[PDB]
Amino acid sequence: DLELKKERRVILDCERDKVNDIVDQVITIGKHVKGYHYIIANLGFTDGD
Amino acid sequence: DLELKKERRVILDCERDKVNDIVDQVITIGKHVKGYHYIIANLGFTDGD
Numbered sequence: 001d002l003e004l005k006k007e008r009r010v011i012l013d014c015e016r017d018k019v020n021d022i023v024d025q026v027i028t029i030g031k032h033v034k035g036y037h038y039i040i041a042n043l044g045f046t047d048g049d
Numbered sequence: 050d051l052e053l054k055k056e057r058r059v060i061l062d063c064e065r066d067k068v069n070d071i072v073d074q075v076i077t078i079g080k081h082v083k084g085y086h087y088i089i090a091n092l093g094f095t096d097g098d
């Protein structure tokens with residue numbers, strides 16, 4: 001549904017558990033290619049894999 | 050190094066073990082995006098994940 005508007009910039013605002021699920025979903029879909037930018041809005045950045 | 054020749058079609062000819070590692074490496078480097086075509090040269094295609 002986000003692909004209809006051609007939106008490349010995504011901002012993630014969740015805890016240390018949902019961010020891993022979103023990352024795994026992006027990996028399975030294939031959105032981590034050069035041309036995107038994610039923002040993990042949380043106090044911890046290196047906590048997740 | 051393969052990206053230098055601008056080659057997108059890759060033919061995989063390995064057992065049921067190396068193909069999984071190659072698929073995992075492709076997933077990690079983000080080459081499974083639309084625009085590539087892989088060929089698994091083996092009798093068992095549904096065997097691997």
Ligand SMILES: *[C@@H]1O[C@H](CO)[C@@H](O[C@@H]2O[C@H](CO)[C@@H](O)[C@H](O)[C@H]2NC(C)=O)[C@H](O)[C@H]1NC(C)=O
Pocket residue numbers: 084085086
């Ligand atoms: C399947 O992957 C191949 C690899 O690019 C593509 O199929 C090509 O399909 C187009 C569309 O019919 C043809 O014009 C080409 O001749 C095909 N062969 C190539 C490009 O080598 C396509 O990206 C994918 N989908 C289909 C339906 O083939």
